[PDB]
Symmetry: C3
Subunit: 159 residues, 3 copies
């Protein structure tokens, strides 16, 4: 009923130099949150390198052509010079959703102060909600737990 897609952003994974350890975790978190999200299913994944054009193209495609309801990105959100996910994300979103970002930061900071190094963006494009999430496997579970109480209503409101 809600079409979720998960974008892994990683030079390493994209080059075939390493496995995606976060993608599967994210899929499985969404999957077991399905009821709480009002019926949602991961319907597509993709891997891109840490390059803004590659990130933008997918977000555009998944929003404008495939009409996903929810896109989660993983990675490319830190202080490393290659971390460009938020900049790519900011170019393509139309309506910022700063409350989602406030909640993720607030909860993540309860676990570790290193949370302050996340530079995630989030917003709506067309009728797709796009949320940047950190690249390590536990992050999606933690962010999804923080957002989950309200994310169902978020997706319903977007229509």
């Amino acid at each position: 009923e809600y079409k979720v897609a998960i974008l892994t952003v990683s030079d390493t994974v994209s080059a075939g130099a390493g496995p995606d350890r976060s993608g599967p975790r994210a899929v499985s978190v969404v999957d077991s949150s399905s009821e709480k999200l009002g019926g949602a299913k991961v319907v597509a994944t993709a891997v891109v390198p840490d390059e803004v054009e590659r990130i933008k193209d997918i977000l555009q495609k998944w929003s404008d052509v495939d009409e996903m309801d929810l896109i989660l990105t993983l990675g490319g959100t830190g202080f490393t010079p290659r971390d460009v996910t938020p900049e790519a994300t900011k170019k393509v979103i139309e309506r910022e959703t700063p409350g989602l970002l406030f909640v993720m930061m607030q909860e993540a900071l309860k676990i570790t102060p290193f949370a302050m190094l996340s530079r995630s963006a989030a917003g709506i494009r067309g009728s797709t909600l796009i949320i940047n999430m950190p690249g390590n496997p536990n992050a999606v579970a933690e962010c999804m737990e923080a957002l989950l109480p309200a994310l169902k209503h978020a997706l319903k409101q977007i229509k």
Copy 2:
């Protein structure tokens, strides 16, 4: 002494299809916060539909021509495709006031996690402070309570 104006953003109310239930609440909250705000009075209200041009025009007019000290908007801050108040507001403000947004979000989240679905913007234009607030009648009371400790000094500082 401080001139407050309150803008209701709502297709329904603007079309005459329904009453403004939030406007009068906001007026009355400002009014009974007058002492705490250093002497403030709601001096004008207006209703506009959920259209960016209509919203921008009023914010411009009230800031540039009427020289309001404080403009509160109500509504148009959610995830609904018609909710365009923050996008309108972002076009017309000059200096962001992210602390006001942090406080409103932080307090609202203590009451309900659905607070994360607010996309309010806020900032200064010329010498007018503009704050987006949620469309339901209790929200202005709650946001004003969150901001009130420091809003007096905010208005003084703007001159």
Copy 3:
């Protein structure tokens, strides 16, 4: 090992009409946080008036030409019409670092609600981290305490 530079923004100080009371405090906070920051030293200070061009030029110079690792600005962050530091900073940064802002706001609000009147910006330009901090002498000590747990890793990540 990390090159820190501290910019004081103040019409009064720049004109010679008054001393810098915050500058020396900031230098001394960085200095005595050196170990915790992985070896950092204030290597340069400058004073500029409350004018965006003056502020931008220095941030550009210190980032592009001198290659500072960390720039702290002091002052020009409130609601006063001359307070233009964040606007100047926003023009020169490339990658926002909103978690640093979230943390400073969160911690400052524990001390006083007037913290919500800070409009600080922060972000990375090239490989320089720029953080706006408030103009009063105790602020840099407080903000640095809030950021310190993670700022070492921030500077390492930027390279």
